[PDB]
Amino acid sequence: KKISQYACQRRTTLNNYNQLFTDALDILAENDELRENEGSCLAFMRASSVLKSLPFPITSMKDTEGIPCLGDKVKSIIEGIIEDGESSEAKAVLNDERYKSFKLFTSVFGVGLKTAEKWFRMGFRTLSKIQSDKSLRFTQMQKAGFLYYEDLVSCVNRPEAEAVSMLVKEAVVTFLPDALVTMTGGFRRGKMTGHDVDFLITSPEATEDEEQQLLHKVTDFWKQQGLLLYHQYHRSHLADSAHNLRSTMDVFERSFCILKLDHGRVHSEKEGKGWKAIRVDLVMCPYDRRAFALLGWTGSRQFERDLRRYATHERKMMLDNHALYDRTKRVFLEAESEEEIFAHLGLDYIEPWERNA
């Protein structure tokens, strides 16, 4: 059984035997991202992903034999960890002022690479200096980011994700009683924590106007209930989906929210102000596209990249979050399940908890 270069042909659980190596590769990948060296970034992400799939810890360079996605640079990183138990390259990145600033500034919701670079070239290094600066101007998203900073850096746990799921279902069924609400993202893959809580909403009987209006009704409901702290709508691009017939362009309508989650709704083993701000991502898809949407929104991000790369390079197929197109047969392939999509691709089925690539 030769290890495939594709994450969609590997089983990746959360039982990682190479966390010393992958933690260092992840820092090195993030450094190339924040510095826009996309090629080097992709090589580090692919190397980290394949080590996450190994059923044993690397203890010598002989263990790397036959493993794909491990270049010369990655190999010297791995060598460095075998000898010392630490990466000199990743340590230098953690000590780098541009990396430290970019990591700290982008940890504010609403702050991307352009705003982070701008603050860094103005000589800013702390969030205290940014927030007290008289001349800086913040976007509405950045203001929410600063207001709810501590709650948002603190990640979401599974008990909080289930409390959000309850509010999502409760909101949705008010307008569409037959709607199916599925928790997607990291939590569907078995993650204990997440940066947000992802959801896919679909209805067997909703009309084009009903499905196109549901997300707007759900946020108005939360605004009326005093639970909406921030929101941003994302219009559907299903009529422009052919952009994916050549990362992916998002095709479904989405509502991104920041929700006020009272402690009393959370059923955990566990104060101050009895509520926490949570990032909630709500995706609405037409019923016949639900299998493609579920596969696309479950992730991981690397698993998605490899599913698409595999479809193109190995099967002359074009996969995106709403469909699968066969370039040879000149037809879209239908699927009512993720299992049917994997079968169409000629891939052994991978469970959501095995998609942690």
Select from 300, 310, 325, 354 the one that contacts ligand DCT (CB under 6 A): 300
Q: Which does 80 bind (CB under 5 to 8 A by kind): ligand DCT, Mg ion, Na ion, none?
A: none
| Residues near ligand DCT (CB under 6 A), total | 15
Give catalytic status of residue 320 as yes or no.
no
Side by side, the strands of the sheet bearing 317-319 are 317-319, 324-326, 331-332
Q: Residue 134: count other Cβ atoms within 10 Å of its Cβ.
A: 4
Let me know if 281 is a catalytic residue.
yes
In this complex, which beta carbon is closest to ligand DCT, that of residue 124 or of residue 256? Answer: 256
Q: How many helices (H) and strands (E) does the chain have?
A: 15, 10
User: Which residues line the annotated binding site?
Assistant: 186-191, 195-198, 281, 296-297
Q: How far apart are CA 49 and CA 4, in angstroms?
A: 11
Q: Which of 143, 301, 316, 327 touches ligand DCT (CB under 6 A)?
A: 301
Measured from the CB atom, is 32 or 196 closer to ligand DCT?
196
Of the residues 148, 175, 297, 310, which one makes contact with ligand DCT according to CB under 6 A: 297
Applying CB under 6 A, which of residues 101, 321, 338, 341 lies at the interface with ligand DCT?
321
Radius of gyration of the chain (CA): 22
Cis peptide before 4 (omega within 30 of 0): no
Q: Which is nearer to Mg ion, 33 or 196 (CB)?
A: 196
Catalytic residue chosen out of the listed positions 198, 250, 306, 320: 198
Alpha helices in the chain (DSSP H): 19-34, 38-53, 72-84, 88-94, 97-106, 113-121, 127-132, 140-147, 149-153, 158-175, 185-188, 208-224, 290-298, 301-315, 338-345
Measured from the CB atom, is 80 or 185 closer to ligand DCT? 185
Binding at 304: pick from Na ion, ligand DCT, Mg ion, none (beta carbon under 5-8 Å per type): ligand DCT
Position 304 contacts ligand DCT (CB under 6 A): yes
Report which DSSP code applies to 2.
P
Write down the catalytic residue from 196, 250, 306, 320.
Answer: 196
Give buried/exposed letters for 185-208 (b at 16+ CB in 10 A, else e): bbbbbebeebebbbbbbbbeebee
Distance separating alpha carbons of residues 248 and 314, to the nearest angstrom: 18
For residue 145, state whether it binds Mg ion (rule: CB under 5 A). Answer: no
What are residue 277's DSSP bridge partners?
A: 260
What does the binding site for Na ion look like in residue numbers (CB under 5 A)? 106, 111
Which residues, in sequence order, are CB contacts of 40 under 8 Å at separation 6+? 32, 73
Nearest distance, CB of residue 201 and ligand DCT, angstroms:
14
Report how far residue 88's alpha carbon sits from residue 81's, in angstroms, rounded to the nearest whole number.
Answer: 8
Q: Based on CB atoms, which residue is closest to Mg ion, 47 or 283?
A: 283
48 contributes a contact to ligand DCT by CB under 6 A: no
Bridge partners (DSSP) listed for residue 280 = 197, 257
Taking the complex as a whole, the smallest distance from the CB of residue 5 to Na ion amounts, in Å, to: 31
Picked from ligand DCT, Mg ion, Na ion, none, the partner binding residue 299 (CB below 5 to 8 A depending on kind) is ligand DCT
Contact between 286 and ligand DCT by CB under 6 A: the answer reads no
Residue of 22, 29, 49, 186 interacting with ligand DCT (CB under 6 A): 186
What is the four-CA torsion angle of 9, 11, 12, 15, rounded to 10 degrees? -160
* Cβ-based nearer residue to ligand DCT, 16 or 300: 300
Residues comprising the binding site for a 2'-deoxyribonucleoside 5'-triphosphate? Answer: 186-191, 195-198, 296-297
Residues engaged in binding Mg ion (CB under 5 A): 185-186, 194, 196, 198
Residues marked active site are found at 196, 198, 281
Residues engaged in binding ligand DCT (CB under 6 A): 185-186, 194-196, 198, 250, 281, 296-297, 299-301, 304, 321
